[PDB]
Design a protein around this nucleic acid. Structure first.
Ligand SMILES: [K+]
Ligand SMILES: [K+]
Ligand SMILES: [Mg+2]
Ligand SMILES: [Mg+2]
Ligand SMILES: [Mg+2]
Ligand SMILES: [Mg+2]
Ligand SMILES: [Mg+2]
Ligand SMILES: [Mg+2]
Ligand SMILES: [Mg+2]
Ligand SMILES: [Mg+2]
Ligand SMILES: [Mg+2]
Ligand SMILES: [Mg+2]
Ligand SMILES: [Mg+2]
Ligand SMILES: [Mg+2]
Ligand SMILES: [Mg+2]
Ligand SMILES: [Mg+2]
Ligand SMILES: [Mg+2]
Ligand SMILES: [Mg+2]
Ligand SMILES: [Mg+2]
Ligand SMILES: [Mg+2]
Ligand SMILES: [Mg+2]
Ligand SMILES: [Mg+2]
Ligand SMILES: [Mg+2]
Lengths: 64, 96, 88, 35, 124, 372, 134, 117, 88
RNA sequence: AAUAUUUAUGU
RNA sequence: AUUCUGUGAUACCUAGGGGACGGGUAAAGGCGAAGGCAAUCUUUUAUGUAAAAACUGACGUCGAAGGACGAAGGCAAAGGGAACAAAAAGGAUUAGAUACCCCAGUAGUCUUUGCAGACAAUUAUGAAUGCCAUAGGUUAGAUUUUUAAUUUAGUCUAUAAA
């Protein structure tokens, strides 16, 4: 799809930087039991997208 | 700058394909977990044996045209949020 | 859906028969009479009411002819203005 | 007042047309033989 | 429960009327020739009318006007008998069976491409 | 630099004819009749007039004189010109009394136009500097945006799905770069409001290190962002968190030019009886009776649903000229589609007789003859 | 009491001649009540705005919808002309190929509407059955 | 490339559905594909009663599978199905226009909505 | 259905039922109107003999022009009376 | 509305 | 009339097998050098069209011959064979009837591999370039105050100068 490694990785990094679970502006009200949960959840969700997209954008899965 | 614009458009698609990768199936674990959850005999309101019983009919033209002429009726608030979100995602590009 | 075409140049713009032909109303009443005979009999009682209707027809006088329609005159006026023009 | 004069003309047309349709139904139905 | 069927097959040169039971098994399978109409006399409109009246009359002898609560009329082909038998089933003869009719269908056989037909004729 | 002949044409009366405005927008996803078309909601062409000295000659200031058969005899001369010269070398025109006299009828009711408010019937006129304004400036806030009536952006709920995609790919997408600047100007204030008090105890608005710092903080609160996106795209408010945003903004000014009165808070002083309580009643038609549900009534050419309440219940061919009932027009307003919706309420009894007195149709006069 | 219904038997008759659906705001003149305007001379209930463009769907990518394919074929299973559909020549070709795709793929009948659609429409009780005959 | 398959297996047994969906599913993932969604439609009437593998069927168990795999896998996926004696028929179709923008809006198989592209 | 399956055949689509608001005689009218709109009688006539592609193509061009000419003629006949009403 | 027997000759 | 049918036909069904054909959509519509190409999924293939920029920098047009492609019919080999149908044969019509019409029917039409190269293979008009005034439709795009108007490349009617 007229993509390359640079454009691909940059889109992944950008896509992850804008969906990172925003931490609360303050630290006293924020407790980890939920913050770290989003981190582990996001990190696990990010790895899934990278594994899926790499296969979709693979040029070996294209046509003539 | 013209080639950059095309790259940005090429990026938004990858960003949209990134958000929609939550429901994909990349490993056999997710596949088996998905099949065993959905391919159950007593799934279609069971009683019904088909999607038709659970969800009467697939959307038709009569139902599509009635969504903009017959009603205009409170789903406007249910839809506008679907469009306001889309507008914000386009301008900001942050996938709200 | 495309719109109607602009007629090509014709020798004359006109309708073949301007006045609608009015089917003799009593050929329809005869068709009904012929129906009773087939279903029942030629010489029966159920045909009396329909046969009389057929007799009432031919006794009634023919209506007067309707006035001639002036459609062809107005078509000849707007021929060159409506179509591509006139030929010949 | 103008709407009254026009509405009346429609009442006549509807009355005339309504008669034609019902009369057509009588002729449409087969009453060729009365038993 | 499927209703009875009153197939009316009609073409340019003959007319067939079959009255079947819900399982689509013929009970009265007659044609214009069964009434004595010979080679060319079996294409006329009046010939098909008498056939319909004969079949309807034969149905009464079999006590089918009190045995068929639901019936279907199937029309095949566009011959003269297509309109003749209808007026029989819509006139005084079919006054008993008219109320039992629940469906009206057309079963004219068409082919999407299909096999090649005969070459056109040069009559002149 | 303009030639003398061209300077006269520019100021010519024929050149002042406005372009045909688009017809009242109807439901795109719906069937319509092909050939026969009735009167439109509001006029799309200009109604023309002449002197009675020239009308006898068919002169209407057009390309050619119009026929005397179809333009002479009537009282009010009105004509609409679809084309000054068509492919048939004729002026395709038509009578203009359908809309020309409907305006005079409505203006004879002496009722202003009010702002629609969901259901204390407080009526506020349209012609008010508080609301009737189109110009604005960047200092405008969202609170003031609820008072305007003319937004340059479309209504999302009203746009069809296809139209919405074109809007995103032709107006919203190419405005990405400009929108970032819009935030820079806003963040120039985000820095300086930290100096809200620095003097009592703006920067140059270019910081790529900041515009990204802000929007990422608004992903948890989508409401505040939508309000910020509407200002840049000039979108009429949709969610309550006011100016009747349910059905959408008006595609026209709220009055629509039909009537410029501001209030009906007057008491027409009757000659004999004196100041009346209500306004003079108006006889209305009955169309589409209840017993296709609901009732319609023709009130001064406009079609409005019958009063909240018989002739309306069923159709009676016995009445001459149709079922006609007297009624009073309470409130009138313009719909987002451009229509004129009248909230009509049945009238009283004595007022109808008071009106018939002047007209003379009152069988029993109320003056003198009335003993009690 | 039949005298009442006898009166309504004529009311619906007259109302059937009112070939017009009055709406709120629709301006009407004394001429809109004449027979010429009430006759409804319009001989076509055409569709407007090219619903395909308005709804912004790709038909070819919606070959699964059994109701969408049955909406663009006559009860006999024949694709509808551009007059009835009221679509542009481009969208007509896209929807025509969508109907031919589903039928050719073997997921939709070619001579009638989908069986599951014939159930919910009228005639469900009288739908032709297949007697086992055995 | 983004494909989509509509398998119509015999009715009566749900096991024959899982094993077939998993056989094709595991096949796509091992090759290197990505399954996007698998909707489980039930058992409803076929377009017409057809005969396949010494059996006369009137209604099959439908199921749609939307995946993104290679051409060699696609051909191998729909060749295993056609070879399996439990499928009444299959309907494979390529999705989209081949462009990234249209290919980024294909999610779950819709029933009450359209694939707006 | 559950107990007895539906007979799915070409005649199924060409079927019209009798209801409270539709009599047997009325079901025939709807049948003839639908059978005439789908041109069943025409196709039966065109399938009796073979028509090679060239002849079929040239036959369509002749029939397709007589429909446009007729449609464009009706537009000029009605456009003539619309101008007559204006007085032109 | 899709009908269809046969008609050679003339310094 | 020949012919089919009591060895149970036609007609109405059920269950299997087998071949080629391509209904609607469909249009003055589109696609290829032409011949020609119309059900469907997947795979595969060279041009062409629109708008923007970028790039190469005359690298272009025509083209004897050679080579390649070339409809239907036909030859050759191996398959297929429902339907249609030269031939051959039979029944009618007719003054006679090889014929036009009819009951039937073999090559052949279809698949694969070659030969063959002739067509009203036509726009009765070789290809290509520059240039000349308008109008009404229509096909695929583009632009716009996308309602309706401009605009590029095709095609088709009716005209001006000629
Ligand atoms: K027989
Ligand atoms: K150079
Ligand atoms: Mg032969
Ligand atoms: Mg002869
Ligand atoms: Mg001589
Ligand atoms: Mg047998
Ligand atoms: Mg086969
Ligand atoms: Mg050719
Ligand atoms: Mg076709
Ligand atoms: Mg080309
Ligand atoms: Mg060359
Ligand atoms: Mg050469
Ligand atoms: Mg050959
Ligand atoms: Mg050969
Ligand atoms: Mg051989
Ligand atoms: Mg011979
Ligand atoms: Mg012979
Ligand atoms: Mg043969
Ligand atoms: Mg060769
Ligand atoms: Mg040459
Ligand atoms: Mg052109
Ligand atoms: Mg062409
Ligand atoms: Mg020319």
């Amino acid at each position: 799809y007229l993509l390359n490694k640079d454009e691909f990785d940059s889109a992944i990094q950008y896509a992850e930087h804008i969906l990172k679970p925003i931490k609360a502006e303050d630290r006293l009200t924020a407790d980890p039991e939920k913050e770290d949960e989003e981190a582990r959840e996001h990190a696990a969700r990010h790895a899934k997208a990278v594994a899926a997209l790499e296969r979709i954008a693979k040029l070996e899965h294209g046509g003539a | 700058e013209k080639e950059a614009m095309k790259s940005e458009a090429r990026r938004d698609a990858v960003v949209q394909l990134y958000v929609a990768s939550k429901n994909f199936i990349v490993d056999e674990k997710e596949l088996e977990e998905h099949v065993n959850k959905h391919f159950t005999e007593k799934i279609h309101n069971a009683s019904g044996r088909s999607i038709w019983d659970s969800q009467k009919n697939p959307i038709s033209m009569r139902e599509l045209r009635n969504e903009f002429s017959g009603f205009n009726t409170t789903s406007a608030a249910v839809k506008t949020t679907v469009r306001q979100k889309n507008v914000a995602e386009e301008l900001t590009g942050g996938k709200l | 859906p495309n719109k109607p075409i602009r007629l090509p140049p014709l020798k004359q713009l006109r309708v073949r028969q301007a006045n609608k032909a009015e089917e003799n109303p009593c050929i329809a009443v005869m068709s009904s009479v012929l129906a009773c005979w087939a279903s029942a009999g030629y010489n029966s009682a159920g045909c009396a009411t329909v046969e009389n209707a057929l007799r009432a027809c031919m006794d009634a006088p023919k209506p007067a002819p309707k006035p001639n329609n002036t459609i062809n005159y107005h078509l000849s006026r707007f021929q060159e203005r409506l179509t591509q023009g006139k030929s010949k | 007042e103008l709407e009254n004069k026009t509405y009346e003309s429609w009442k006549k047309w509807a009355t005339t047309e309504i008669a034609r349709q019902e009369s057509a139904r009588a002729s449409m139905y087969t009453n060729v033989v009365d038993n | 429960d499927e209703p009875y069927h009153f197939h009316i097959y009609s073409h340019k040169h003959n007319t067939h009327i079959t009255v079947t039971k819900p399982n689509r098994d013929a009970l009265i399978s007659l044609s214009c020739g069964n009434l004595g109409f010979k080679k060319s006399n079996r294409k006329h409109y009046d010939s098909a009318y008498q056939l319909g009246a004969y079949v309807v009359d034969k149905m009464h002898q079999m006590n089918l006007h009190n045995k068929i609560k639901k019936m279907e009329v199937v029309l095949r082909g566009f011959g003269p008998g297509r309109e003749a038998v209808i007026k029989v089933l819509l006139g005084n003869e079919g006054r008993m069976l008219r109320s039992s009719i629940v469906r009206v269908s057309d079963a004219t056989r068409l082919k999407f491409g299909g096999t090649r037909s005969k070459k056109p004729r040069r009559l002149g | 630099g303009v030639s003398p002949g061209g300077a006269l044409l520019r100021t010519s009366r024929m050149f002042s004819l406005p372009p045909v405005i688009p017809p009242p927008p109807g439901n795109k996803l719906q069937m319509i009749s092909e050939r026969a078309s009735a009167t439109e909601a509001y006029p799309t062409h200009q109604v023309l007039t002449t002197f009675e000295s020239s009308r006898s000659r068919g002169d209407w200031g057009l390309k050619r004189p119009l026929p005397l058969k179809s333009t002479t005899g009537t009282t009010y001369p009105m004509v609409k010109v679809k084309e000054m010269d068509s492919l048939e070398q004729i002026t395709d025109f038509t009578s203009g009394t359908q809309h020309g006299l409907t305006l005079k009828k409505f203006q004879a009711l002496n009722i202003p136009i009010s702002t629609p408010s969901e259901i204390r019937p407080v009526q506020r006129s349209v012609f008010e500097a508080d609301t009737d304004v189109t110009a604005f400036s960047p200092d405008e806030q969202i609170q003031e945006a609820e008072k305007r009536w003319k937004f340059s952006g479309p209504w999302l709920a009203g746009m069809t799905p296809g139209e919405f995609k074109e809007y995103l790919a032709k107006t919203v997408r190419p405005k990405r770069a400009e929108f970032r600047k819009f935030i820079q100007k806003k963040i120039a204030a985000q820095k300086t409001e930290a100096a809200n008090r620095e003097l009592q105890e703006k920067p140059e608005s270019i910081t790529d290190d900041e515009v990204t710092e802000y929007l990422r903080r608004l992903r948890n609160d989508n409401q505040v962002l939508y309000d910020l996106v509407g200002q840049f795209l000039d979108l009429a408010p949709l969610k309550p968190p006011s100016p009747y945003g349910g059905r959408g903004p008006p595609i026209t000014h709220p009055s629509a030019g039909i009537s410029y009165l501001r209030t009906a808070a007057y008491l027409n002083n009757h000659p004999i009886y004196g100041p009346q309580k209500s306004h003079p009643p108006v006889q209305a038609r009955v169309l589409k009776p209840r017993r296709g549900n609901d009732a319609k009534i023709g009130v001064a050419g406009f079609v409005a649903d019958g009063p909240l309440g018989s002739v309306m219940d069923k159709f009676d061919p016995s009445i001459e000229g149709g079922a006609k009932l007297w009624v009073n027009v309470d409130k009138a307003t313009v719909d987002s589609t451009g229509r004129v919706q009248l909230t009509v309420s049945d009238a009283k009894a004595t007022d109808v007789l008071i009106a018939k007195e002047l007209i003379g149709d009152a069988r029993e006069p109320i003056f003198g003859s009335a003993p009690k | 009491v039949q005298e009442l219904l006898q009166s309504e038997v004529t009311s619906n008759n007259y109302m059937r001649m009112m070939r017009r659906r009055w709406n709120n705001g629709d301006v009407y003149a004394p001429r809109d009540l004449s027979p010429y305007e009430m006759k409804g001379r319009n001989g076509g209930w055409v569709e407007a705005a090219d619903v395909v463009d308005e709804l912004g769907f790709s038909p070819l990518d919606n070959y699964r919808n059994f109701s969408l394919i049955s909406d663009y074929i006559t009860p006999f299973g024949r694709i509808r002309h551009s007059k009835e559909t009221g679509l542009k020549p481009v969208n007509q070709r896209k929807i025509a190929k969508m109907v031919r795709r589903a039928i050719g793929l073997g997921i939709h009948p070619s001579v009638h509407k989908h069986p599951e659609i014939l159930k919910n429409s009228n005639g469900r009780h009288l739908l032709p059955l297949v007697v086992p005959k055995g | 490339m983004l494909y989509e398959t509509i398998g119509i297996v015999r009715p009566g047994n749900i096991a024959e559905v899982k094993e077939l969906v998993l056989t094709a599913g595991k096949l796509i993932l091992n090759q290197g594909g990505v399954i996007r969604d698998i909707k489980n439609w039930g058992t409803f009437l076929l377009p017409r009663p057809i005969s396949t593998n010494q059996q006369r069927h009137n209604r099959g168990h439908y199921f749609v599978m939307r995946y993104d795999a290679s051409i060699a896998t696609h051909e191998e996926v729909r060749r295993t199905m056609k070879a399996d004696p439990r499928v009444i028929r299959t309907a494979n179709v390529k999705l989209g226009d081949g462009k990234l923008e249209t290919l980024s809006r294909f999610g779950a198989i819709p029933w009450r909505s359209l694939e707006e592209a | 259905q559950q107990e007895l399956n539906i007979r799915l055949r070409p005649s199924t689509g060409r079927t019209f039922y009798v209801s409270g608001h539709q009599d047997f005689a009325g079901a025939l009218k709807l049948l003839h109107r639908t059978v005439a709109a789908n041109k069943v009688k025409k196709d039966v006539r065109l399938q009796r003999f073979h028509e090679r592609p060239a002849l079929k193509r040239k036959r369509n061009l002749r029939e397709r022009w007589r429909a446009r000419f007729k449609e464009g003629f009706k537009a000029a006949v009605n456009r003539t009376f619309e101008l007559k009403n204006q007085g032109w």
